[PDB]
Write a protein that binds this ligand. Sequence first.
Ligand SMILES: COc1ccc2nc(C)c(O[C@@H]3C[C@H]4C(=O)N[C@]5(C(=O)NS(=O)(=O)C6(C)CC6)C[C@H]5/C=C\CCCCC[C@H](NC(=O)O[C@@H](C)C(F)(F)F)C(=O)N4C3)nc2c1
Ligand SMILES: [Zn+2]
Length: 197
Amino acid sequence: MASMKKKGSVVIVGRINLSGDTAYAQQTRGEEGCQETSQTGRDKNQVEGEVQIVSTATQTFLATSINGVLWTVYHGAGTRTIASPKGPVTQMYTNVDKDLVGWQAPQGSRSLTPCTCGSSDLYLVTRHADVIPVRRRGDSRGSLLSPRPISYLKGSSGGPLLCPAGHAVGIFRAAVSTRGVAKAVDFIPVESLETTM
Ligand SMILES: COc1ccc2nc(C)c(O[C@@H]3C[C@H]4C(=O)N[C@]5(C(=O)NS(=O)(=O)C6(C)CC6)C[C@H]5/C=C\CCCCC[C@H](NC(=O)O[C@@H](C)C(F)(F)F)C(=O)N4C3)nc2c1
Ligand SMILES: [Zn+2]
């Protein structure tokens, strides 16, 4: 009872820069500072952009701001708080049935706009800043135009699927593979987020 530990916070450790002509990952915090920030929950680093790279003590994945909420996957974050300049911030959305969590978007982040284009020509943004064309195949599924080993998608849950106009269509949740090759992706549609809200 007196020995019981507390899980650390999710920590923003970088971002995917989409502001220019070139997408690229930036690290903003190294592993040591990440471990310390997870324990204190106090992160005074300035936040920028739409897609954050986040980490716990044991996992790293992505988180995406849409309409003022930083969204990610329950299988990454669980029920964890996120570190912030004035301490841990409790989730404002949690839905294990959708593999979905959300916190208020950090000060300084930019939010994607929810897509209303009805387009099926999508783009998945990974933690390595690859921008992967995906054809929408259903409410929560899309096929990769160029399949590739699942290794290339590992760590990108919580990242966005975008429409041609750069709106948010969904949050990457799981990969569908055959013999280790990702042929399709499973994602949380933005309408499911907009309803949760
Ligand atoms: C605990 O409470 C819950 C509640 C609801 C959940 N709901 C789902 C869905 C789920 O799924 C799991 C996790 C997810 C996954 O792995 N996510 C990616 C990823 O990067 N995570 S991550 O960042 O590395 C990580 C782990 C650090 C956070 C995008 C993948 C990239 C590569 C894939 C690696 C191989 C695993 C394939 C598996 N495929 C799958 O399940 O396909 C479904 C749709 C099927 F089977 F029906 F086809 C799958 O993708 N996952 C299996 N866990 C749930 C758990
Ligand atoms: Zn759109």
